[PDB]
Amino acid sequence: ILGGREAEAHARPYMASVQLNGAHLCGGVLVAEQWVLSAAHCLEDAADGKVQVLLGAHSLSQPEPSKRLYDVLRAVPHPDSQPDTIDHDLLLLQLSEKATLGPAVRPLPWQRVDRDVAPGTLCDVAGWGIVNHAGRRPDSLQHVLLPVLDRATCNRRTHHDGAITERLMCAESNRRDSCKGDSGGPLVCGGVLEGVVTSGSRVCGNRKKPGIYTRVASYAAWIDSVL
């Protein structure tokens, strides 16, 4: 996250770190007792590396009572995702067992009503992705509050030039923005999951290239079918 701040530890108990060979790779969101939602492009090329999900965490390196690494039984990329497109960029990870729930580990309710948010709704995005142009990686969870950007502005020739489908939404990216390492993580509006970060626009913090987030409500049947 460019332009953000240290999140309050454990205040986002749905927050997951998707790990490959023991390093943070992408964000994710605990959406059911045994399921984490993330981005398909995270695992596009993961081959036979070891995929794990860290729940209950603030710090990636320090021990914490609620922090537990889970193994993954199955990774379920959206069947219509492709490397090299921005569309359908969702991935469901089935944990090897149901997660132990508590104050620091809880699934987030997610949006099932397929209608847009009001423009300018302030939504929260969190992640362990890079935090400056040099590529610094934070040990602990960062977040930013971002206003939703209306799809027509987002689709301007100056902006993403028609690529924002009904299945996607935008948030402003003026210096505050999701970046590498934050894909898969949650965009939360009104206490409900609304979007999942995607890298479709790979640049970071350029206000003319808004953040793109995949709309969970648009994929409700798919999420239910996989659960």
Contacts with ligand E7W by CB under 6 A lie at 26, 41-42, 173, 177-183, 197, 199, 201-202, 204, 211
Q: Would you call 66 a catalytic residue per the annotation?
A: no
Active site residue 88: no
For residue 75, the minimal CB distance to ligand E7W (Å) is 13
Min CB(66)–ligand E7W separation in Å:
25
Distance CA 204, CA 156 (A): 18
CA 125 to CA 223: how far, in whole Å? 21
Compare residues 168 and 179 and give the one whose CB is closer to ligand E7W.
179
The DSSP bridge partners found for residue 37 are 29, 92
* 106 vs 180, beta carbon nearer ligand E7W: 180
Q: What is the DSSP secondary-structure string of 68-82?
A: EEEEEEEEEE-TT--
Specify the residue, 33 or 87, whose C-beta has the smaller distance to ligand E7W: 87
- Cβ proximity to ligand E7W, 26 vs 92, nearer residue: 26
CB environment 65-79: b (16+ within 10 A), e (fewer): ebbbebebeebbbbe
Minimum distance, C-beta of residue 97 to ligand E7W, in the bound complex (Å): 26
Query: How crowded is residue 152: how many other Cβ atoms within 10 Å of its Cβ?
Result: 10
| Shortest distance in whole angstroms from residue 140 CB to ligand E7W | 18
Task: Report how far residue 227's alpha carbon sits from residue 209's, in angstroms, rounded to the nearest whole number.
Answer: 34
Q: Which is nearer to ligand E7W, 41 or 58 (CB)?
A: 41
Three-state secondary-structure class, residue 151: helix
Closest approach, Cβ 205 to ligand E7W, in A, equals: 7
- Annotate 83-132 with DSSP letters as a single string: TT--TT--EEEEESSPPPPBTTB-PPPB----SPPPTT-EEEEEESS--S
Phi-psi region of 221 (alpha: psi -120 to 50; beta: other; left: phi over 0): alpha
Candidates 10, 41, 78, 160; catalytic one: 41
From 78, 89, 178, 201, active-site residue: 89
89 is catalytic: yes
Residue nearest to ligand E7W (CB): 183
Is residue 171 within 8 Å of 148, Cβ to Cβ? yes
Where in the sequence numbering do the catalytic residues fall?
A: 41, 89, 183
